[PDB]
Amino acid sequence: VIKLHDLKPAPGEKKAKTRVGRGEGSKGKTAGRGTKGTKARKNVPVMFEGGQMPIHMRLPKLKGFKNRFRTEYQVVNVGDINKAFPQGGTVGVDELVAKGLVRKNSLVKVLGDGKLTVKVDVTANKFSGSAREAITAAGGSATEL
Amino acid sequence: ARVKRALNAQKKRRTVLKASKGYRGQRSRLYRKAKEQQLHSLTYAYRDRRARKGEFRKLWISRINAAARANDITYNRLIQGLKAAGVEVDRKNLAELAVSDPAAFTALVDVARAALPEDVNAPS
Amino acid sequence: AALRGALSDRARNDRIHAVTELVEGQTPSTKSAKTFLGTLTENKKVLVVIGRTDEVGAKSVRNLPGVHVISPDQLNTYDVLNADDVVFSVEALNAYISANSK
Amino acid sequence: PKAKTHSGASKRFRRTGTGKIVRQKANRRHLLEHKPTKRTRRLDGRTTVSAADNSRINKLLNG
RNA sequence: CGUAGACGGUGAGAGCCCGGUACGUGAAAACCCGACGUCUGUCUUGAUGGUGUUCCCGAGUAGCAGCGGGCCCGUGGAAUCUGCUGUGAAUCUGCCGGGACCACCCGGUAAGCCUGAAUACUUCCCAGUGACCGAUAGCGGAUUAGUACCGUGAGGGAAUGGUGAAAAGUACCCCGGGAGGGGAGUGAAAGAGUACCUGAAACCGUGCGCUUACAAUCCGUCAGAGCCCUCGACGUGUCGUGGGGUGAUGGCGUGCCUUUUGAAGAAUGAGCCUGCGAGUCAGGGACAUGUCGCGAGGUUAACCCGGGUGGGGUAGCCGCAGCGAAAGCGAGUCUGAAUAGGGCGUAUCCACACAAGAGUGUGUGGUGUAGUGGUGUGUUCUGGACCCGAAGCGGAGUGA
RNA sequence: CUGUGGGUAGGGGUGAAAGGCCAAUCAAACUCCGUGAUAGCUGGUUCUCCCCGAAAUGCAUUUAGGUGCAGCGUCGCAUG
RNA sequence: AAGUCCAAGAGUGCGGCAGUGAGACGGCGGGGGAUAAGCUCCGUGCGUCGAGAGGGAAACAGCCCAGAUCGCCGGCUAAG
RNA sequence: GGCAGCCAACGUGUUGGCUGGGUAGGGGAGCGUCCUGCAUCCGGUGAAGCCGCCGAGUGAUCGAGUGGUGGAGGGUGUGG
Ligand SMILES: [Mg+2]
Ligand SMILES: [Mg+2]
Ligand SMILES: [Mg+2]
Ligand SMILES: [Mg+2]
Ligand SMILES: [Mg+2]
Ligand SMILES: [Mg+2]
Ligand SMILES: [Mg+2]
Ligand SMILES: [Mg+2]
Ligand SMILES: [Mg+2]
Ligand SMILES: [Mg+2]
Ligand SMILES: [Mg+2]
Ligand SMILES: [Mg+2]
Ligand SMILES: [Mg+2]
Ligand SMILES: [Mg+2]
Ligand SMILES: [Mg+2]
Ligand SMILES: [Mg+2]
Ligand SMILES: [Mg+2]
Ligand SMILES: [Mg+2]
Ligand SMILES: [Mg+2]
Ligand SMILES: [Mg+2]
Ligand SMILES: [Mg+2]
Ligand SMILES: [Mg+2]
Ligand SMILES: [Mg+2]
Ligand SMILES: [Mg+2]
Ligand SMILES: [Mg+2]
Ligand SMILES: [Mg+2]
Ligand SMILES: [Mg+2]
Ligand SMILES: [Mg+2]
Ligand SMILES: [Mg+2]
Ligand SMILES: [Mg+2]
Ligand SMILES: [Mg+2]
Ligand SMILES: [Mg+2]
Ligand SMILES: [Mg+2]
Ligand SMILES: [Mg+2]
Ligand SMILES: [Mg+2]
Ligand SMILES: [Mg+2]
Ligand SMILES: [Mg+2]
Ligand SMILES: [Mg+2]
Ligand SMILES: [Mg+2]
Ligand SMILES: [Mg+2]
Ligand SMILES: [Mg+2]
Ligand SMILES: [Mg+2]
Ligand SMILES: [Mg+2]
Ligand SMILES: [Mg+2]
Ligand SMILES: [Mg+2]
Ligand SMILES: [Mg+2]
Ligand SMILES: [Mg+2]
Ligand SMILES: [Mg+2]
Ligand SMILES: [Mg+2]
Ligand SMILES: [Mg+2]
Ligand SMILES: [Mg+2]
Ligand SMILES: [Mg+2]
Ligand SMILES: [Mg+2]
Ligand SMILES: [Mg+2]
Ligand SMILES: [Mg+2]
Ligand SMILES: [Mg+2]
Ligand SMILES: [Mg+2]
Ligand SMILES: [Mg+2]
Ligand SMILES: [Mg+2]
Structure with a gap:
């Protein structure tokens, strides 16, 4: 019979924490920080490069704009339709959602990548x-709503 | 869970101060000062365990030399002759013979001298 | 899955018992329940699973030292693994099986 | 609190379909008269960020 | 015994000794919540068409302009909202919004008012809880504590808990002016005596053993005479597989930390002991790496229902298709006049054709694609962010 | 000259002018609060052992005793 | 083409975590200096120190010999 | 003659080869302290703490080995 005192974590599940600044036998004194400088007492921001014009400023902005009104489609390939409907049948959006092919509230476009061997509406x-x-x-049949 | 340090902390202090009995002044009485001396004391001990082997060999060699020269042979020719005769007695026991049994040492000197080359200062 | 694992371990070791009532009638009696539980299990810790309505059964076992009382909708791994034996009211066992296996 | 993405980095770098970080090249904004077309062509298009800069740029994009 | 085995107390671990506990029971009065009346309002003729260049529909208002404020929006192509200063309309064909503006449609009906619930908080009162503290901790404050004390003032601001089960707190005698102590008592214990539980260390004595006044000592270390003690066997002391204390004398030997090319350094820090004093925590945060669940799916947020740690909750989120500035197209897509060449993409591999030895490519087939949610660890982000330390900068007060 | 009583308050007062003096503190008083101000600077950072083990160079820098990237360490995976 | 090859604990690529970016002297090739400095600035699959104890150099980070896993009252050698 | 890391060779953990100076620093494995879930054990026939003795482990350290002092709690295993 398994009791509470029989419950062990899995091998390798738990790792002991590192405790710095607890003696020279471990990460003692400087706790891994080396000696002096900015980094001895604080962290350096990732954006900072020492005064040189940073990478995120000397490169041009990516060209173009984003269309606020873009209609993006969830997509299904017909090769997925084969595996999901071996019998064939009627396949509406509800059937695709129930079968895990698309997300539930999305606009669906069907694409041609896979081979289709089954008769499908x-x-x-x-x-x-x-x-x-x-x-x-x-x-x-391919009917577009 | 606030942890008081005394229980854990005192253990190493008792160890160091026990090891520093017989030291003079602060080095026997104060943990911090005794700790410092303990660093030197164990360094010295490690170093002298190594050096002790040379120091004893030095003593044996000196005693062998005195006994050899009392038998009209130098140390260096004695060691050469014992090697040539194939006598594998080491210097610790050669010195013990020189002290405790001069007759046995004298017999070893005769063996060594017989095995020496006729002209020690000749080529080869 | 953890709760199922714990209950399966008891079931395999025959540590699961089923009972119609801990006591007869509408008067709590610790003496009756102690005797009856003694007939079922002699182990110290026992988890008793009773429906909400069975006040008289709950009160009757409540005071016994190693006994812990729980409703079947509150069943949990810690209390199962802490108990040597699990004792179900028939109504509570059926309620647990129904809510899960349906 | 949520980590904030770096605004300027997210305007200058993009991820490809396989997670490579891409960027445009500098020196194609003005002073183009003296630059041969072969130079402007070399500078056109996108390019994969150097391995040296990948780690910092990842940090700026992720937060 | 138990509907009571909560938690305390009682001369040491108490369900059955005590206060209690489970469970029941109780209010003259006052207060609070109802219900019911009185009492107060209010209503009692409504439905149904027609008709019209008729009247009304919130004015110093809307709008507009200047200068501002605030909105993701830092004046911007800047709508919407809003202050001040000018100017200043229409009553339904009206007017105001749908991110300059215009047209057309759609929504709404400004310049009058009131409005419960879901939300925020706890000086104070009641009942509880803690992998919270336990007297240098926890509140500054277990002790006259915002007291003593400091400052003209605003204001600053401490330290001090434990005899014993019971005071049974030591009658009486002795030395002493007392203080204090010695006998004698009390007590299980005064190795508990109001200086009081336990009683560490620094620091200060007394006694005993060894050693030291011809010596140049980082104070120790390795050899080591002599003496003292102790454990064995033997005998009068003497040797051993011994063990301790001390140590004449010989060799070797430049403190610790920090910080430096380099410090015994005549560079920094430390008089000594005890106690305290520095990588922590939060977030479905970010990257990586263990581990566990489920798996082409994984998972819920708020919230709802359980005296719990359990159950429910699909809104979301992350995978599932890419390419492109975008319209868009889609295992392709973008550039381009190209059926040109490149870029990015089509998990990964295997076999077979067909072109290339210009780096191998292009087609057929197969094989199939791994994510996500807990949680450990490392780093990181926003916060004091490992800890200590300025000169100074504001706001509001206190002082001649 | 002096007693008593009174008035002027902090970028302000007062000054027969020394930046004098304004409660033993004045080239901008004191107190509380923002507040654990900020210090590329100085100091400090506590138990152990086992394996590996640097650098003091290059480039850039309102940079030169700071920092970014590279070089050189280590751990994991891959390729041998 | 072989060697090393129960390993140099080697290269190369990616990822987690770094530290370092004040160097010193000695040999050899050079600039600056007066072919001065224990001077200063470079080069060197050059060395040691740094981060290296032991032996030698009277003492003596940077020279000569030699890279300390622990124990031994064994033996042979290095520089000297 | 003892210990350790890497690798090999086989075996149901031993044998062999090589390797084990180290600061910044990386990785691995542990000691001691307190509070707790669960399980067990000791304690007025004397717990903790403190002072010793005699011993123990490769280190942090240990003693459910024992004297003295002391007067109410403590140990161990596995998890948090
Ligand atoms: Mg944690
Ligand atoms: Mg260190
Ligand atoms: Mg230190
Ligand atoms: Mg430092
Ligand atoms: Mg430095
Ligand atoms: Mg640094
Ligand atoms: Mg920031
Ligand atoms: Mg030797
Ligand atoms: Mg342009
Ligand atoms: Mg051109
Ligand atoms: Mg009790
Ligand atoms: Mg109106
Ligand atoms: Mg504005
Ligand atoms: Mg408008
Ligand atoms: Mg109102
Ligand atoms: Mg105390
Ligand atoms: Mg206090
Ligand atoms: Mg004052
Ligand atoms: Mg006063
Ligand atoms: Mg006592
Ligand atoms: Mg006292
Ligand atoms: Mg006392
Ligand atoms: Mg003398
Ligand atoms: Mg001398
Ligand atoms: Mg000397
Ligand atoms: Mg210097
Ligand atoms: Mg250094
Ligand atoms: Mg000094
Ligand atoms: Mg000095
Ligand atoms: Mg200095
Ligand atoms: Mg000093
Ligand atoms: Mg200023
Ligand atoms: Mg001020
Ligand atoms: Mg005033
Ligand atoms: Mg006055
Ligand atoms: Mg002047
Ligand atoms: Mg003054
Ligand atoms: Mg100022
Ligand atoms: Mg602030
Ligand atoms: Mg600071
Ligand atoms: Mg090494
Ligand atoms: Mg600049
Ligand atoms: Mg760097
Ligand atoms: Mg520099
Ligand atoms: Mg430099
Ligand atoms: Mg140099
Ligand atoms: Mg020089
Ligand atoms: Mg070296
Ligand atoms: Mg040396
Ligand atoms: Mg020889
Ligand atoms: Mg020679
Ligand atoms: Mg081995
Ligand atoms: Mg090592
Ligand atoms: Mg070695
Ligand atoms: Mg290190
Ligand atoms: Mg303990
Ligand atoms: Mg007693
Ligand atoms: Mg305790
Ligand atoms: Mg633990």
Whole structure:
């Protein structure tokens, strides 16, 4: 019978903490900081480079702008549709969400990467060209909502 | 969990002060001063355990030399002759023979001198 | 999973018992419960799992030194592993099985 | 408190699909008349950050 | 015995000795919460169409302009909100918002007022809790404590707990002016005597053993005569597989720390002991690395319900497709006139063709892709951020 | 000259002017608070053993007794 | 092409954690200085010290010999 | 003759080869202190603390080995 005193952490789970400044037999005296200078008593900011124009200032800003109104799509490849629906069937957004192929509230576009061997009626917000071809050529329908 | 230091702290103090019995003045009485001397004392002891081997050999050699020269042979020729005769007695026991049994030492000197080359100062 | 592991360890060692009631009627009696628990287990620490409503059973065992009383919805690894034996009211055992296995 | 990302670094560096940190090159903003097109071409486009600078830039981007 | 085995106390570990505890029970009066009346209001004719260049719909207001304030927004293309100073409208075709502005649609109806709950806090009172402190700690304050004391003043600001179960606190005698002590008593103990539990160290004595007044000593170390003590066997002392104390004399030998190219250094710090005094903690923070759960999925936040550590809670978050300034396209995409060449991307490998020996590439097939949530550790971020230390800078007061 | 009583207060007072004096403190009083001010500077940082083990160079720097990156250490993984 | 190869505890790449960025003297090749300095500034798969105890150099970080895992009242040598 | 690290060789932990000066510094493994979950044991027939003796471990240190003092708590194992 297992009791409370039988409960042990897993091998390698717990590591003893390092306690600096506790004698010369360990990390004593300077506690790993060496001697004198800024670093003996404080940390140096990551942005600082000694006065030289920092990397994050001498390089140009990346070109362009971000479109506030961008519509981004969650994507499913038809090769995933094969594995998730071996029987084929009707595959709407609800079916893709239940099958773990897309996140639940998202706009879905279907893409052509995988091979499609199964007849599928696919309903999604958008299709790639190659997705159109694979859905139709296996004898299925591609309806965009 | 506030921890008082005395229980743990006193242990090393008692050890050091026990080891420093017989020292003079502050070195027997005060932990900090006794600790300092203990550093030297154990350094000296380590060094002298090494040096002791040379010091005893020095003593044995001196005693062997006196007994050899009382038998009309120098130390260096005695050691040469004993090597040539193949006598493997070391200097600790050679000195004990020189003190405790002069007759046995004399017999060893005769063996050594016989095994010496005819002309010690000749090539080869 | 930790709770299931703890309960499985007791079950394999036959340390799980089931009972209709700790005492008969509507009057708490520590003497009755002590005798009855003595018939079930002779070990010192016992976890008694009773439904919320069974005040008379809870009160009857409450004062016994090694006995700990818990409702089945509050069942937890620490109290199971601390006990030598787990004693379930039938209602509490069924309630635990139902809430989990359904 | 949440770690704050460095504003200027996040405007100058980008991550690729595999996590490589990329940047644009300096010396292409002005004074272009005397610069041959071969020089301006070499300076065009993006480039992977040097291994020496990777660790600091990662820290600035992550927080 | 137990619906009571909470926690204390009592001459040492008490469910059954005591206060209590579980559980029950109780209020004259005052106060507080109700319910019920009185009492006070209020209402009692409403539905239903038509009709119109009719009237009304919150004015020094909105708007506008100048200078400001505040909004993610530091004057910016700067909307919305708002102060002061000018100027100053319309009553529904009205007017104000939908980030300059205009048009069109949509939303709303400014310049009148009131409004419970969910939220914040605890001087004070009641009941409890602690992998909180235990007398240099914890409040400054267990002791007359904001006292003594310091300062003209604002203001600063301490130190001091333990006899014993019970005071049974030592009658009486002796030395002494007392103080203090010695007998005698009390007590289990005065090796508990109001200087009081335990009673460490520095520091100061007395006694005994060895040693030391011809010697140049970082004070010790390794050899070591002599003496003293002790444990064995033997015999009168003498030797041993011995053990201690002291130590004539010989060799060797330049404190510790900090900081320095280099310090015994005549560089810094330390009179001595005891006690105290420095990498800590918070956050679904960041990177990495252990470990555990689940796994193409992992996980909940707030919150809800349990006297708990348990159950519930899908909003989110992180993986799952990339490329591109972006529109966008998508296992590709961007650049470009290129079916050109590059960039980035298509987990990783294996076999087979087809082109290249210009670095090998391009197609078919297979093999399949690992993340995420706890938690240990290292580093890091924002905070005092390992600890101590300025000269000085503000705000509000106190002083001739 | 002096008693008594009174008035002027901190970037302010007062000064037959010395930056004198303003409660033993004055080239800007004292007290509390912001506050554990900030110090690229000085000091300090406490138990043990086992394995490995540097640097005092280069470049840049309102930089030269500071710091960033590289060089040189160590631990892990990979490649042998 | 071989050697070393129960390892130099070697190289190379990536990642965690550093420290260091005041050097000294000696040999050899040089600048500055008066072919002065225990001077100063460079070079050197040069050395030692730094961070190295032991032996030698009377004493004597930087020269000569030699790299201390511990014990021994064994033996042989190095510089001298 | 004892200890240790790396590696090899086999075995259900021993044998062998090589290696073990070290500051800044990295990594690994431990000693002692207090408070606690659980499990056990000792204590007015004398706990802790303190002073000794006689001994012990490679180190921090240890003694559920024992005298003295003392008067109420303490030890051990495994976790936090
Ligand atoms: Mg922690
Ligand atoms: Mg150190
Ligand atoms: Mg120190
Ligand atoms: Mg220092
Ligand atoms: Mg320095
Ligand atoms: Mg430094
Ligand atoms: Mg910052
Ligand atoms: Mg020798
Ligand atoms: Mg341009
Ligand atoms: Mg051009
Ligand atoms: Mg009790
Ligand atoms: Mg209106
Ligand atoms: Mg503004
Ligand atoms: Mg508008
Ligand atoms: Mg109001
Ligand atoms: Mg005390
Ligand atoms: Mg106090
Ligand atoms: Mg004053
Ligand atoms: Mg006064
Ligand atoms: Mg007593
Ligand atoms: Mg006293
Ligand atoms: Mg006392
Ligand atoms: Mg004399
Ligand atoms: Mg002399
Ligand atoms: Mg000498
Ligand atoms: Mg100097
Ligand atoms: Mg140094
Ligand atoms: Mg000095
Ligand atoms: Mg001196
Ligand atoms: Mg100085
Ligand atoms: Mg001094
Ligand atoms: Mg200023
Ligand atoms: Mg001030
Ligand atoms: Mg006044
Ligand atoms: Mg006056
Ligand atoms: Mg003047
Ligand atoms: Mg004055
Ligand atoms: Mg000033
Ligand atoms: Mg502040
Ligand atoms: Mg400071
Ligand atoms: Mg080494
Ligand atoms: Mg500059
Ligand atoms: Mg660096
Ligand atoms: Mg420098
Ligand atoms: Mg330099
Ligand atoms: Mg140099
Ligand atoms: Mg020089
Ligand atoms: Mg060296
Ligand atoms: Mg030397
Ligand atoms: Mg010889
Ligand atoms: Mg020679
Ligand atoms: Mg071995
Ligand atoms: Mg070593
Ligand atoms: Mg060695
Ligand atoms: Mg170190
Ligand atoms: Mg202990
Ligand atoms: Mg007694
Ligand atoms: Mg205790
Ligand atoms: Mg622990």
